[PDB]
Amino acid sequence: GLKKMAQPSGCVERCVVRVCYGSTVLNGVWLGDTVTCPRHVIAPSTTVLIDYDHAYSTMRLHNFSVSHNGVFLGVVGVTMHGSVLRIKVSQSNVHTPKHVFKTLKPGDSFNILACYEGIASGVFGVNLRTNFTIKGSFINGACGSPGYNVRNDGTVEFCYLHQIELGSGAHVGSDFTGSVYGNFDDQPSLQVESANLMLSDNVVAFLYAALLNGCRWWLCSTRVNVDGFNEWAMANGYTSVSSVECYSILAAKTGVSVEQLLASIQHLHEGFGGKNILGYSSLCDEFTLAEVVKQMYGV
Amino acid sequence: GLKKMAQPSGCVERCVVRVCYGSTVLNGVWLGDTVTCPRHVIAPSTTVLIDYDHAYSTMRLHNFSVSHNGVFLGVVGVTMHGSVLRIKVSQSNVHTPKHVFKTLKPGDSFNILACYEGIASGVFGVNLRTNFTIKGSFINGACGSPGYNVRNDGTVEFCYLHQIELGSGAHVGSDFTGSVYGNFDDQPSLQVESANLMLSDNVVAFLYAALLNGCRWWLCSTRVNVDGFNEWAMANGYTSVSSVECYSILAAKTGVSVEQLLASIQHLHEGFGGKNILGYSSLCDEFTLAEVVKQMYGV
């Protein structure tokens, strides 16, 4: 059985703080003696385009309020890096987990801790889509909500800070270096993301999951090679498939080659009409290979 | 935007323990000086039916091993209550959150912290279905994984301890008093759950979410009142609708009455052919009213 789940949030909850500048309130991430937050916190209230360079040049440190669970931290310095601020504070977070920073690539799964006024309210797993947006759930004040992964050694990978919701409802964030994923503008605008592709690697992972639940009515007997599929993928709204050698685990447990699943993707590209696969009426690119392996085997 | 989320898990992570008796390992929840865990931990290794009363009478405290984060706790006494043990340990959990114990009813949403060897690995929201089972994702060792809700005042409601997976893959748990949801037996058996009913309260919330996102191709101008809908629901695999006024905030914002959505459910009960509602191709009962209002308005 396949369920989208998040990794536990306790160690990240202990890093979320409330960052306020003037009347503007959002979330920051407190690691060591640095709070990273979206630079939107220093935006003037206006309907015109925001000049962040000018806002930064006119920034006053005393207008900041940074607090963790009601207790205020003293701000020592602030620098701007891309779309984020690094706020130096006089107190290091004693609960800072063993961590790294990691930039996501499309198809990567990670966890969002949705926060408001510095307090986590929900946690959920997401996938970074090919247009570099995620399908999250955020309302006003969620800016700065962190995204993370936890490695097997317990190292927390900090990979996302929520920035904006697009007119389509899709969500845009930055990494901890300040780069906005997909280079969207980190302010109100009419920008429209390009259309998503189906993440073929994940469709392949999903079909392997159905094979392990005895769901194989859709199993094609033919195989297509990667080059053939990738040519078909470009013409039909799918990404290229990365490699065959990753899925040996499920190839050796089914025992179906990925080329058989690639052929099956071509046959199942239109509707199932009207059957289902693991309850889905169309192909699902929600789950990665790592997720499927962890959920069926714990490895 | 609707995303199934879990409430943050950190306060519950600090209560999860590894409980071992002999070779059998599962999870427990340490509150104050008490660990609650499924009684399966004292089950003898055998294929024939387990006599828990006999296993309890032959129990020796020194066969227990209880640890939090690998730190072992001393077992002082044990009592059996239905399908759980209450293990008294020789020190109190300093991180015990303000809490209560609450028995769930069908239709209630709650959060699962999926744990293995006393260590949380995933967190997800679920609904208790009408057949008293949940659709989780668990592999071997998840027994004792806790279910919880966090009230607005921050009180944790402990409501579920994972017990068994039925042959169908459906998941069965107990409350913290030891009563198994749905009266299932807490040992391997051929038992089968009753048919799952569509949770009508959640479907109405879902349709309101669709309307608030501008998806209304499906909206019926017919009205069916609660009594008539509940009759129809008996004949069509749906629960009764519990009330109408609960939705008034959504009824006001959309201009659409609950009775219109009830008629819409009767219209959409077969299928959408082949349109979608918020991406779903059949009626969705995954989201409660409370979830929809919280995720769209913060209330």
- Count of DSSP E strands of chain A? 13
Major sheet details of chain A:
7 strands, antiparallel
Query: At the fourth CATH level, what is the homologous superfamily of the domain at 200-297 in chain A?
Result: main proteinase (3clpro) structure, domain 3
- Widest sheet: strand ordering of chain A: 5-4-1-2-3-7-6
Can you tell me the CATH topology of the domain at 200-297 in chain A?
main proteinase (3clpro) structure, domain 3
What's the multimeric state? homodimer
Q: Most extensive chain contact?
A: A-B, 37 and 37 residues
Strand content of chain A: 25-35%
CATH class of the domain at 200-297 in chain A: Mainly Alpha
Distance between the termini of chain A: 15 Å
Total of helices of chain A: 7
What is the string of helix and strand elements of chain A?
HEEEHEEEEEEEEEEHHHHH
CATH architecture of the domain at 200-297 in chain A: Orthogonal Bundle
Radius of gyration of chain A: 22 Å
The structure class of chain A reads alpha+beta
Q: Which shape of chain A, going by the Cα principal axes?
A: elongated
Helix content of chain A: 10-25%
Organism (chains A, B): Human coronavirus NL63
Active site (chains A, B): 40, 143
Protein name (chains A, B): 3C-like proteinase
Domain Peptidase C30 (chains A, B): 1-299
